[PDB]
């Protein structure tokens, strides 16, 4: 830092960042009686003494499932009209096959989306109708068959994976065809070079810089897309948020199962042996102890699921805001959509989450020359309409704030308002004008 030293980026780079945001988790519909009393009529009768106590848990789980469906709808169903990409794909030299859907693939998902799907393992699929193959599992039965024994169900999401991929494809086609106009009203199409020029104009960089560098910008974008694809492929875990969500849900279910095997301070943890080896009038104490323990475990699971659902709903609201701002527009807020001056963002469907490809404009190699707050031509202070008053070293120039494109100081690019004796740091220089010459 110095009194009259400014650094202006003579170049720039296009960097694509990846943002991982969960939007929903596995919806659970745990039943009261099956988990509390295994097919025991008198045990269910004793549980009835607790009143409408587990109806609260059932209502909470139903509300959680409805909330997950609403979160997915809010995040992905932003546009009520599905937009299809043009049959040919030449967006001013911009690669888009990596993020656009691949019709060859049976699921009609983009390569990035398929990599994300293969990089995430779901403990409980749910939408597979696992019954029928649970008995034919040959090996030891997995978590799902055991869960289906003690009142644990995983309702499938309202939007299928292919359906969410279709929604993401519609958003992507709308964005890359009509810019951001489809996020406000009708999809007003615009050529991709023009859309990129206006995204550049939205970050304080003039429109001409993109058209002068139409190439080496598309190449940079393609290189960034390929680099992030390889980074997600070869990374240890870049889907940490979604993996954490899935693991937390699965392990909460596992703990809920494991609490059945606990005796909860009673003679045994097995209901049928208890009521068979002890007559009901005496065994009622053991039954009540088991019911209190299992109900406390179910309460803990439901409360933990509610807290995790609140966290997931906050994350899904953040993802919906990120979509509506970065995807359907260009957010001027810093660091909201990637690191750097945000240009675009490409949604990518992920298992129980969303993936944002924040295309950000980042400066590059820069040199610091000189600056002056104002230029005095004839007893008057001249200020730049846009940009700063940079200097080669001998002759001053006006240039953009975020790109080194020097221009001669005319009377149209700078406005004059002052008296040459009020600005601290005004420098001696001459300004021209297209009127006095002719």
């Amino acid at each position: 830092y110095s009194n009259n030293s400014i650094a202006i980026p003579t170049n720039f780079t296009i960097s694509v960042t990846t943002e991982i945001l969960p939007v929903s988790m596995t919806k659970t519909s745990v039943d009261c009686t099956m988990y509390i009393c295994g097919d025991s009529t008198e045990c269910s009768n004793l549980l009835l003494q607790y009143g409408s106590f587990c109806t609260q848990l059932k209502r909470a789980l139903t509300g959680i499932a409805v909330e997950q469906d609403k979160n997915t709808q809010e995040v992905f169903a932003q546009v009520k009209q599905i937009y299809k990409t043009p049959p040919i794909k030449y967006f001013g030299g911009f690669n888009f096959s990596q993020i656009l859907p691949d019709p060859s693939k049976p699921s009609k998902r983009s390569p990035i989306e398929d990599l994300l799907f293969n990089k995430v393992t779901l403990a409980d699929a749910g939408f597979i109708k696992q019954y029928g193959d649970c008995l034919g599992d040959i090996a030891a039965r997995d978590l799902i068959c055991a869960q289906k024994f003690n009142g644990l169900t995983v309702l499938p999401p309202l939007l299928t994976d292919e359906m969410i991929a279709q929604y993401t494809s519609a958003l992507l086609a709308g964005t890359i065809t009509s810019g951001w106009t489809f996020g406000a009203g009708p999809a007003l199409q615009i050529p991709f070079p023009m859309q990129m020029a206006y995204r550049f104009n939205g970050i304080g960089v003039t429109q001409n810089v993109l058209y002068e560098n139409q190439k080496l910008i598309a190449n940079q974008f393609n290189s960034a897309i390929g680099k992030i694809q390889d980074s997600l492929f070869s990374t240890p875990s870049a889907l940490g948020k979604l993996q954490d969500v899935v693991n937390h849900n699965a392990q909460a279910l596992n703990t809920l199962v494991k609490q059945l095997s606990s005796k909860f301070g009673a003679i045994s943890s097995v209901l049928n042996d208890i009521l068979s080896r002890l007559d009901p009038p005496e065994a009622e104490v053991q039954i009540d102890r088991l019911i209190t323990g299992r109900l406390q475990s179910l309460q803990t699971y439901v409360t933990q699921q509610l807290i995790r659902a609140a966290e997931i709903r906050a994350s899904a609201n953040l993802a919906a805001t990120k979509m509506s701002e970065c995807v359907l527009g260009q957010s001027k807020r810093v660091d909201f959509c990637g690191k750097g001056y945000h240009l675009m963002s490409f949604p990518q469907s992920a298992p129980h989450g969303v993936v944002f490809l924040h295309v950000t404009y980042v400066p590059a190699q820069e040199k610091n020359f000189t600056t002056a707050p104002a230029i005095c031509h004839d007893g008057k202070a001249h200020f730049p309409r846009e940009g700063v008053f940079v200097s080669n070293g001998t002759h001053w120039f006006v240039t953009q704030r975020n790109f080194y494109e020097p221009q001669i100081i005319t009377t149209d690019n700078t406005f004059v308002s002052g008296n040459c004796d009020v600005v601290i740091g005004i420098v001696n220089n001459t300004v021209y004008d297209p009127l006095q010459l002719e």
Binding site: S29, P86, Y131, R141, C145, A146, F149, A173, V257
Partner: protein
């Protein structure tokens, strides 16, 4: 040879060895699931559709034939009102290939609604919106 029991990760009996023939058998839950009743407004109509969540409902049909299902009531299963989805199969509602907006969400991209055939509940794949190819 010394193994008689059989368990899994979450400490539940998975398989059992036959003590009389020295053969192995694995154990699976019988038909556990969840019943959800799909219905339009009771001021509109009284017909309902029952969704047995998460079950291959061919087994539900054979259980109905054996009359061993826990719910006492029995919806009409005339063959047309069966549609195996990924959240069980809807009984009492037919499937139409037409795509409309969601009215009563079910799961796995299936939504049931009341429509004229003369009124019945029809299940269908939800329509995300009017497709609009941008020029």
């Amino acid at each position: 040879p010394f193994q008689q029991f059989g368990r899994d990760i979450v400490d539940t009996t998975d398989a059992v060895r036959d003590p009389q023939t020295l053969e192995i058998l694995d154990i699976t839950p019988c038909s556990f699931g969840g019943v959800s009743v799909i219905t339009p407004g009771t001021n509109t109509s009284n017909q309902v559709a029952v969704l047995y969540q998460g079950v291959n409902c061919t087994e539900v049909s054979v259980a109905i034939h054996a009359d061993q299902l826990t719910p006492t009531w029995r919806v009409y299963s005339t063959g047309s009102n069966v549609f195996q989805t990924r959240a069980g199969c809807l009984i009492g509602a037919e499937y139409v290939n037409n795509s409309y907006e969601c009215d009563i969400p079910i799961g796995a991209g299936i939504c049931a609604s009341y429509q004229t055939q003369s009124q019945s509940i029809i299940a269908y794949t939800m329509s995300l919106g009017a497709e609009n190819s941008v020029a």
